Structures are given as structure tokens and as C-alpha cells.
């Protein structure tokens, strides 16, 4: 057993972080989740996620790796062991969440091997996979609305190629499996060390994707119609905020987009010194964080509203209202640049980057928990060659179920349900209140000063108390009492096996803390008074 | 231990002239965690400069500090008859904390 | 008004031991660290023991890292500091300093016990 390893400089764990969460989630989901939610209104609840939860809970599991020097699940060893199931809910959320990103990358690099043409296909749609009701969007306020644009057909008919349902996946697309099995490559033959361990990374990670977000953020707002777009974006509708969607869809978008139910921000603080001040740190990484997702949101939206200037329908209509929305409205606008190749290959060549860091990073955090789980069965040798080409293996496996002719319904349903539903709200909840009340405010503020220097303010106490158990709480009990079934693009209606599959999914994400609790608590011999504190006592 | 060499103890200025006085320390000190305390004569010391640079609550404005990761100083822009005082500065990251060695400022 | 008086101060044989308490007033003395900061005739100042807010984080200095303890009393708000093997590079002058960020230092002292050994 070799003493574990530390980050060896500062700017390792930034760059970790900084390629750990800015991703999909801030240039793919956070657009079709707030076009999803009428724009306006995804916002207040995104800030109020973001600023008494979101920041909070980050620094929260940053904070517990740095002090427990473990990833996951073997941090809640000297975090109230009772509740170390925790650990095991976020090894199941970030499994689950590994399948269905890495599905992401592999309908991006789809796009990238598409992207090569003199003329893009989806820039123009006198194709095979083109229905008869087509024609160029320039073309759509001149002809007499059953009409469908070229970029939505390429989505739906030859990235997809979209079934009549979750009933009918259809046939194994060997296309998008073989996009998914070279990506899967990708990320295999990085966790085995080989790659991202250079110096080469800062100009790579953190330098291209976001040089191309401002490109994309120069075009959009500069489209005629982007104005319209901005205005759906920003400006709140008050009524939609009575709904439980916005409040599930905004507050597990801040829980998912920083990554933080997931065992990967506690592995990757666990690997900081001691006496290193992760607080700075890591409000200039939510900061940018955030900041990536509302500007790359100002460029989609203006995108999305020159997209419904130019074909004559309503903004919330124009698109896709479900996971595809970055892959319409994205390649729309690459297709609006001087020479749209080229940037067709750099926008996908961003997505994969931003998408293929942060795989990278859940990977290794869940592959991180799991050799902490067991050190010395799954040394620095050979066993984890094998385990990892096991997880890598079983996760591409059952990824070809999402990757079908049918697998965006099965997508959509890990999306909502398997990795950012109430399972979400329940893990960070439970790590909030097992910090706030099991732990104490005092207690765990007292662990950060010793290691931090200082004492955490009224916000971090306040919201670990309060306001995230209480937001994770009003969302939790609110999405059941005013409950809608999960649609795709607000047509598809889900069959109820469906539904309890994805509810199936979540509570194999929620269920591992009670099970875990019970387990403690029939393993350990005395009276229930008894098991119970020793089982909240730290090791 | 972190031993924090100081300037020399004596240092004789008029009033009204600026002076500076560094700290040396042996090992690398992380510049927010090096504070300047100036005791009186016949006092308990007061926190004077914190972080090598921000000023406590009654410091002067005319007070300033620089320096880091290993030089630090403390700068009197216009000495007035009340800063004859001893200043120390104390590295407050290691957990062996250690002060650095008098400073004394005398008038003429 | 943050107010730090010490007491228990005074002539001890060497080897002995002596007790000080730094009755903390003014402020929340279970957030803060406070530590104890001697000052020598000399008038070098050398810090002595560090403790957390709630006690569960204990620093000593090399002189003093196996003879000297350092204590709470949350509920009645004094600090306290426990000697035993007074050694005659012990006397000094006592204070009690309230530092808990680490980026801020002792922004509170104390008053002054005069510990003499002899
Ligand atoms: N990286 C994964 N898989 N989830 C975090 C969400 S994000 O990185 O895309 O922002
Ligand atoms: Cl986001
Ligand atoms: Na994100
Ligand atoms: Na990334």
C-alpha cells in the first residue's frame, strides 16, 4: 500500500477543476434546460441554486477531500460513517452519469466526422435522410406550419435517427456506436496516464474551448434576431416559477453542472495539501464556472432567436426543447460563419474537448473512490489496467442502449432521472445536513480553519444548515406534490415502465444511503442508542 | 523552525523622515500570512500590519507594508513622535509560529 | 469591546508548575483560536501553544511542545494554560492572543502575566 499521492503543485487541482466541470453542462444542458423552462424564468432559480447551494455544496466536498485524504466514499469515514452511503449514492449518480456524457461525446464526434464536407450536411437538406417538407431556412418565410429545418432533420434522422419511441429502440446505429466506442478509446487510454499528465494541457483545456465559446458568443450576437433570443433568455415568466420543472430542472443544473454529488470534487480535493486554501480557489472556479454557462447561454439563445427571425416561428418552437438543443442551434449558427467547415471541425473539436476533460475527471473520481474503497486490491500496477478497461467496458456497454435508433428516449431518461434528478437534491442534501447536524457547523468550520487558516462565513454555515437542506427539501417534497411525468421535445409522452425505469435509475441513486444506513446498523452489535453513535462517531 | 531575521534592533530616525525595516525569514512565508505587531514601550503588542500589506483598524494610513515569500518590510511614510515602538514580524502559516526579533524605533 | 485579561502569574520554583487564565470577554470565545504569546526579558517575543476554537486542534512551540497544555473553557469563556517543568528559560511575560484567521494573526491581545523562575 503506497502512501497517497498528492497534486505536487497548485495549479494541478485548478486545472482538474477547471477541466472538471466546465463542460457539457454549461454549453449543452444548461441551454435546452433553460429553453425547456421558457429561458426567463430557469434563471432564479439558477442563481438561487447557484448562490445558496451550488457554491456551497462545491467548496463543501472540495473542503471534505481536503481534510479526509479520500475520494468519495472513504471520506465519510471521519464525516459520520452511519451516512457513509453518501459515497456509494455518488459512485452510482457519476456511473450513470459517465454512460450518458460519454453517449454526448459520441453524437459530438458523429458531428466531427460529418463536419470534414465542402458542405455541411445539416447546412442544407436535399440529403437521403431529408423528409419531403424541407427546404433551407432561408427559404421559410417565402413558401406557404408542418415544415421542418435542415439542421433539425440531420439531428433527428441521421445523427439519431429518431424512432417513434422508448418502445421502439430499433436497430444498434453502428455509426454513432463506433463514435462511441473511439471516444470510449479516448478516455480509456487517458485514465491509464499516458495523456493529460503534461504541460501542454493549460493551452489545450483551458485556452481553445473557451477562445471558441467567444467566437460563438461573437456570432451569435451579432445575428439579426439575437435580440429576440436574449429577451427569451433573460426576461422571467413569473407564472412558469409555480411549476416544479424549472426549480428540479434549475437546481440539479447547478448540482450537476459543478459536479457535486458525485464523489469527483472530493477526490480531487483530496489530493490537495493540507494547508492549501481550496475557498479562493474555488469560488474563481464557480465563478467561471457559472460565468461559462450564462455567456455560452447568451450565445445559444441569440442563436435560438435568430433561428426564429429567420423561420417565421415562436422561439420555444423553433428548436429542439429536449437534449439535442446545442446540436441544432450550434451547428445552425457554424453554418452562419465564413468558411463553416473549419469551424464546424473547431466547435466539435471544443464539445469533445470540454466533454472529454470532464469525463476524464468524473472517470478518475469514480475509479478514485473505488481504489480508496479497496487499497491493495486495485494497486498503481496491473489491476488497475483491468479495472479500468472493466468500468470503461461495462460503461460503453450499456451506453450502445442509449445509442440506438431509439436512444435519445433512453438518454433523456438517464439525463433527467439517472445522474441530475431528485437524486441530486438528495445526495447534496444528505451531505449538507450529515456536515450541518451530525458533523456541526462548528465542528466541521473548526476542521476548515485548521487547514484553510480561517473561519467560513455566515454563507457556508447559513447554507449548510439552512438553505441548501431546505432547498433540496422544498424541490424534493414540490416536485412530488405538483408531479408531471418526464416529456422528450413536449411531444413524446413517456410510457409508465419508462417512467419507472428512470425512477428506478434515480432511486439506485438515492436508495444507497438508507440501505447503507440499515446495513451499518445490523452489522454493528448493541442497542439502536448504542450503533447509532458509534456509527456518527468519526474514524 | 521558521526563523524570521530581522533588521537590527536599533534604529534611531527624526520625526517626519521615512524609514523601512525588513524581515528575513528561512523559509518561503505565503505573503498573506506574515503580520507586523508594534508593542510599545511598557505595552502588549498590537496587530499592526496583517498579510504583509492590509492595515489594522487605528493604523495610520501613513503605515504600509511590502514585500514577499521571503523579504518583508513595513514603510513609515512620516514618522510622528508616536511611533517610537518595537515592530515585529511573525509568519503565522507553519504551525511552529515564530516572531521575528525586535525593531525598535527611537527619536533623536 | 473584545477584552483578554490574564491572571495566575507569578514566582515559581524551578521545575514546578503554575496555571494562567485568560478570561475572554466581549466576544464568541468558542469561534475563535486563541493562543498564548510569551514575551522574554529580552524582549523577544516567541509564541507558546495555539488552540482551536473547539479544542480539538492543539499546537505547541519546540520549547514548550512536551511540558506546557494549552485549554478551553467554552462555557465560561477562559483560556488556560497548564505548566509543569518550569525550566529556568521560562520566565517571561504572558499573553493571551486571540488568533483564529490565519490571514489576520492575533489582531486581539491581552494584558500581561509576569511568570518569573526562580
Ligand atoms: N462532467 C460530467 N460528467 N458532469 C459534470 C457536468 S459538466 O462538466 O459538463 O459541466
Ligand atoms: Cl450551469
Ligand atoms: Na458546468
Ligand atoms: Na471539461
Redesign the interface.
Known amino acids: 500500500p503506497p502512501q497517497r499521492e498528492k497534486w505536487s503543485s497548485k495549479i494541478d487541482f485548478v486545472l482538474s477543476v477547471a477541466g472538471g466541470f466546465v463542460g457539457l453542462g454549461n454549453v449543452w444542458r444548461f441551454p435546452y434546460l433553460c429553453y425547456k423552462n421558457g429561458g426567463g424564468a430557469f434563471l432564479i432559480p439558477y442563481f438561487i441554486f447557484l448562490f445558496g447551494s451550488g457554491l456551497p455544496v462545491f467548496f463543501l466536498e472540495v473542503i471534505i477531500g481536503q481534510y479526509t485524504s479520500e475520494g468519495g466514499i472513504t471520506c465519510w469515514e471521519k464525516i459520520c460513517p452511519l451516512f457513509s452511503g453518501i459515497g456509494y449514492a455518488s459512485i452510482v449518480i457519476v456511473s450513470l452519469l459517465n454512460v450518458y456524457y460519454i453517449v454526448i461525446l459520441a453524437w459530438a464526434t458523429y458531428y466531427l466526422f460529418h463536419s470534414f464536407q465542402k458542405d455541411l450536411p445539416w447546412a442544407h437538406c436535399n440529403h437521403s435522410w431529408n423528409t419531403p417538407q424541407c427546404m433551407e431556412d432561408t427559404l421559410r418565410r417565402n413558401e406557404s406550419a408542418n415544415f421542418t429545418s435542415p439542421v433539425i432533420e440531420f439531428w433527428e434522422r441521421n445523427v439519431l435517427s429518431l424512432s417513434s419511441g422508448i418502445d421502439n429502440p430499433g436497430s444498434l446505429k453502428w455509426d454513432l456506436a463506433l463514435c462511441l466506442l473511439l471516444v470510449w478509446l479516448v478516455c480509456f487510454f487517458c485514465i491509464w496516464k499516458g495523456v493529460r499528465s503534461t504541460g501542454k494541457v493549460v493551452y489545450f483545456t483551458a485556452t481553445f474551448p473557451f477562445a471558441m465559446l467567444l467566437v460563438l458568443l461573437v456570432r451569435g450576437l451579432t445575428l439579426p434576431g439575437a435580440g429576440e433570443g436574449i429577451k427569451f433568455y433573460l426576461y422571467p415568466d413569473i407564472s412558469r416559477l409555480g411549476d416544479p420543472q424549472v426549480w428540479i430542472d434549475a437546481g440539479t443544473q447547478i448540482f450537476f453542472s459543478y459536479a457535486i454529488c458525485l464523489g469527483a470534487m472530493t477526490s480531487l480535493g483530496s489530493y490537495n495539501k493540507y494547508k492549501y486554501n481550496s475557498y479562493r480557489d474555488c469560488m474563481l472556479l464557480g465563478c467561471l464556472n457559472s460565468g461559462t454557462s450564462f455567456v455560452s447561454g447568451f450565445a445559444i439563445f441569440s442563436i435560438l432567436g435568430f433561428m426564429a427571425q429567420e423561420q417565421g416561428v415562436d422561439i420555444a418552437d423553433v428548436a429542439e426543447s429536449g437534449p439535442g438543443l446545442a446540436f441544432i442551434a450550434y451547428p445552425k449558427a457554424v453554418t452562419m460563419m465564413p468558411l463553416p467547415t473549419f469551424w464546424s471541425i473547431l466547435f466539435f473539436i471544443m464539445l469533445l474537448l470540454l466533454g472529454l476533460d470532464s469525463q476524464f475527471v468524473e472517470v478518475e473520481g469514480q475509479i478514485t473512490s473505488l481504489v480508496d474503497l479497496y487499497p491493495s486490491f486495485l494497486r498503481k500496477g496491473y489491476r488497475r489496467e483491468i479495472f479500468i478497461a472493466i468500468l470503461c467496458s461495462i460503461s460503453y456497454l450499456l451506453g450502445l442502449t442509449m445509442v440506438t435508433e431509439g436512444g435519445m428516449y433512453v438518454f433523456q431518461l438517464f439525463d433527467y432521472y439517472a445522474a441530475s434528478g431528485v437524486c441530486l437534491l438528495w445526495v447534496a442534501f444528505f451531505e449538507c445536513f450529515v456536515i450541518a447536524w451530525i458533523y456541526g457547523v462548528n465542528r466541521f468550520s473548526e476542521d476548515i480553519r485548521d487547514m484553510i487558516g480561517y473561519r467560513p462565513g455566515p454563507w457556508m454555515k447559513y447554507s449548510w444548515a439552512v438553505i441548501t437542506p431546505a432547498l433540496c427539501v422544498g424541490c424534493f417534497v414540490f416536485s412530488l406534490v405538483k408531479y408531471v411525468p418526464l416529456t422528450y421535445n413536449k411531444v413524446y409522452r413517456y410510457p409508465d415502465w419508462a417512467i419507472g425505469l428512470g425512477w428506478g435509475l434515480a432511486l439506485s441513486s438515492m436508495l444507497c444511503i438508507p440501505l447503507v444506513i440499515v446495513i451499518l446498523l445490523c452489522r454493528t452489535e448493541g442497542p439502536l442508542r448504542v450503533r447509532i453513535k458509534y456509527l456518527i462517531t468519526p474514524r | 523552525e521558521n526563523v524570521l531575521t530581522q533588521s537590527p534592533a536599533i534604529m534611531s530616525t527624526s520625526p517626519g523622515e521615512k524609514v523601512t525595516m525588513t524581515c528575513r525569514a528561512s523559509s518561503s512565508v505565503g505573503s498573506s500570512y506574515l503580520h507586523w505587531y508594534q508593542q510599545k514601550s511598557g505595552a502588549s503588542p498590537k496587530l499592526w500590519i496583517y498579510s504583509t500589506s492590509n492595515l489594522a483598524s487605528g493604523v495610520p494610513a501613513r503605515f504600509s507594508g511590502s514585500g514577499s515569500g521571503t523579504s518583508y518590510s513595513l514603510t513609515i511614510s512620516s514618522v510622528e513622535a508616536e511611533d517610537a515602538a518595537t515592530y515585529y514580524c511573525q509568519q503565522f502559516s507553519g504551525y511552529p509560529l515564530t516572531f521575528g526579533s525586535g525593531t525598535k524605533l527611537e527619536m533623536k | 469591546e473584545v477584552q483578554l485579561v490574564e491572571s495566575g502569574g507569578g514566582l515559581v520554583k524551578p521545575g514546578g508548575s503554575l496555571k494562567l487564565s485568560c478570561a475572554a470577554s466581549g466576544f464568541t470565545f468558542?469561534?475563535?483560536?486563541m493562543?498564548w504569546?510569551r514575551?522574554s526579558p529580552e524582549?523577544?517575543?516567541?509564541?507558546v501553544a495555539?488552540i482551536?476554537?473547539?479544542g480539538?486542534?492543539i499546537?505547541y512551540?519546540?520549547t514548550v511542545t512536551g511540558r506546557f497544555t494549552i485549554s478551553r473553557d467554552n462555557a465560561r469563556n477562559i483560556l488556560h494554560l497548564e505548566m509543569s517543568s518550569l525550566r529556568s528559560e521560562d520566565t517571561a511575560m504572558y499573553?493571551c492572543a486571540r488568533?483564529?484567521?490565519?490571514?489576520?494573526?492575533?489582531?486581539?491581545?491581552?494584558?500581561?502575566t509576569t511568570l518569573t523562575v526562580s
Open positions: 468558542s469561534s475563535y483560536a493562543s504569546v514575551q524582549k523577544r517575543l516567541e509564541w495555539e482551536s476554537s473547539g480539538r486542534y499546537y512551540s519546540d499573553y488568533g483564529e484567521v490565519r490571514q489576520r494573526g492575533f489582531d486581539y491581545w491581552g494584558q500581561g
